Amino acid sequence: ADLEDNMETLNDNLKVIEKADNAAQVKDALTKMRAAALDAQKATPPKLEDKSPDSPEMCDFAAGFHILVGQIDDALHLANEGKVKEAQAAAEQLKTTCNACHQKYR
Amino acid sequence: ADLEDNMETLNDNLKVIEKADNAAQVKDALTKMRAAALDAQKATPPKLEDKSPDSPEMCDFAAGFHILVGQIDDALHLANEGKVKEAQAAAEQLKTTCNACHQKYR
Amino acid sequence: ADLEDNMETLNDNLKVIEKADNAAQVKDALTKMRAAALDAQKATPPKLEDKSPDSPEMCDFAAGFHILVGQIDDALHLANEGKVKEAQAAAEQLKTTCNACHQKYR
Ligand code: HEM
Ligand code: HEM
Ligand code: HEM
Ligand SMILES: CC(=O)Nc1cc2cccnc2c2ncccc12
Ligand SMILES: CC(=O)Nc1cc2cccnc2c2ncccc12
Ligand SMILES: CC(=O)Nc1cc2cccnc2c2ncccc12
Ligand code: NI
Ligand code: NI
Ligand code: NI
Numbered sequence: 001a002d003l004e005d006n007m008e009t010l011n012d013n014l015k016v017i018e019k020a021d022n023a024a025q026v027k028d029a030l031t032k033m034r035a036a037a038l039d040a041q042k043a044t045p046p047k048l049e050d051k052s053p054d055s056p057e058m059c060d061f062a063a064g065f066h067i068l069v070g071q072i073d074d075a076l077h078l079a080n081e082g083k084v085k086e087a088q089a090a091a092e093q094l095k096t097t098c099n100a101c102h103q104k105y106r
Numbered sequence: 107a108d109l110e111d112n113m114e115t116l117n118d119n120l121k122v123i124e125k126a127d128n129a130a131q132v133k134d135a136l137t138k139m140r141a142a143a144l145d146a147q148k149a150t151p152p153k154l155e156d157k158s159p160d161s162p163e164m165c166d167f168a169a170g171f172h173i174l175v176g177q178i179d180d181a182l183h184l185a186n187e188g189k190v191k192e193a194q195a196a197a198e199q200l201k202t203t204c205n206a207c208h209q210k211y212r
Numbered sequence: 213a214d215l216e217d218n219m220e221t222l223n224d225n226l227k228v229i230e231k232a233d234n235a236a237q238v239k240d241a242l243t244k245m246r247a248a249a250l251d252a253q254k255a256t257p258p259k260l261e262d263k264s265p266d267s268p269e270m271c272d273f274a275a276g277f278h279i280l281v282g283q284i285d286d287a288l289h290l291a292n293e294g295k296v297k298e299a300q301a302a303a304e305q306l307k308t309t310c311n312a313c314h315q316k317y318r
């Protein structure tokens with residue numbers, strides 16, 4: 001999907017995590033987010049359209065999704081053990097990564 | 107499989123490697139060990155049950171199977187080249203990675 | 213496929229790229245090259261037959277294909293955006309990595 005569609009998936013699903021009751025719900029939402037971050041990593045953002053793929057910008061752009069995925073995995077690990085509240089508090093910490101890339105490239 | 111079962115798999119097949127006649131026997135046994143190592147890496151050990159996935163402890167545990175798997179691959183390469191005695195020796199060097207992790211987490 | 217077959221493939225498609233009209237041909241060629249590099253990374257070159265899979269030499273051999281594959285990925289990206297001329301320029305810089313390996317290990 002488009003960079004746009006993937007970001008939607010990230011955004012809506014972060015909302016789903018915040019108001020989840022059980023860990024299955026957090027797990028499912030974290031799994032959809034993981035898929036969409038891997039896919040958003042393949043897109044060229046409008047701001048970078050002039051840059052070759054080995055430039056520091058493009059590489060730092062793909063690095064942003066490497067971190068986010070790493071963080072989603074942490075939250076996934078917690079959801080899998082039924083630890084709902086620490087998995088939610090793990091997902092909160094994704095935002096810093098979201099905002100930071102947006103400061104740079106959005 | 108869980109941790110205990112996986113460690114049994116590691117142990118028994120290391121013993122097969124010691125007794126092995128040909129490269130095929132070694133190769134087969136290393137493959138099983140590879141898979142058991144990758145499976146055990148997914149588990150939380152009892153000593154670390156209370157630990158965050160982000161822990162220095164959980165990461166150093168996960169890393170121990172990363173070292174182990176890389177060593178298996180070294181031994182796997184030699185088994186593939188028909189080199190039994192050098193595959194056998196490569197597997198004897200696994201032992202130290204066994205011992206270091208058990209010292210911390212067993 | 214042995215080393216020779218994979219290198220033949222590497223050589224052939226590099227030419228295809230050089231005389232190509234459009235991005236599709238370049239992309240098709242680069243996709244065949246990538247498969248060949250990954251497959252050649254599995255081979256023990258005749259010069260390093262005695263060498264341990266642990267060797268600085270063997271490790272350095274594997275690393276060469278890692279660089280080649282990354283450079284092919286750079287070139288794939290460009291052909292995908294439909295930037296023929298600049299994908300071709302990216303493919304021209306591959307020869308650096310071909311030659312450096314040949315001087316050592318061929
Ligand atoms: C879970 C964390 C994230 C959330 C909730 C999120 C959410 C969003 C939302 C709602 C948009 C606007 C969608 C639109 O109006 O089309 C957006 C756009 C964007 N995001 Fe994120 N995002 C996250 C992570 C990231 C990261 C880590 C990066 C950097 C690699 C990134 C890069 C971008 C870019 C470049 C745009 C602009 C899209 C465009 O205008 O074409 N996002 N994001
Ligand atoms: C090939 C090398 C290895 C061998 C031969 C080996 C063998 C064993 C054996 C025989 C046990 C007996 C306990 C049981 O029956 O469950 C065991 C347990 C255990 N092993 Fe290993 N192991 C190896 C590598 C590792 C590594 C690298 C780690 C850590 C990264 C590790 C972590 C553990 C832990 C945490 C236990 C105790 C689990 C529990 O309390 O249920 N092992 N292993
Ligand atoms: C696109 C880049 C490359 C091209 C076009 C290329 C091309 C070739 C060609 C045409 C041969 C001779 C085949 C024959 O025997 O007739 C060859 C041999 C060889 N190349 Fe490459 N090569 C490339 C990259 C590499 C890399 C990255 C490495 C190692 C990291 C490497 C290592 C070798 C070795 C070891 C041989 C000797 C094969 C043998 O004697 O059996 N090459 N190469
Ligand atoms: C250093 C890095 O990750 N660069 C790249 C960054 C990229 C960012 C978005 C889309 N593609 C790429 C890309 N594609 C092929 C090769 C490299 C890249
Ligand atoms: C740094 C690291 O490897 N941490 C982890 C360590 C882990 C150790 C056992 C089981 N799972 C994990 C884990 N799971 C998801 C995300 C991270 C980890
Ligand atoms: C660092 C590295 O990639 N060394 C190796 C380099 C290799 C080069 C050709 C074929 N196999 C290997 C290999 N196989 C198993 C384990 C390690 C290697
Ligand atoms: Ni897509
Ligand atoms: Ni985990
Ligand atoms: Ni299991």
Ligand code: NI
Nearest residue numbers: 183254255265
């Ligand atoms: Ni190998």
Ligand code: NI
Nearest residue numbers: 213214251254
């Ligand atoms: Ni082959």
Ligand code: NI
Nearest residue numbers: 042053288289
């Ligand atoms: Ni790309």
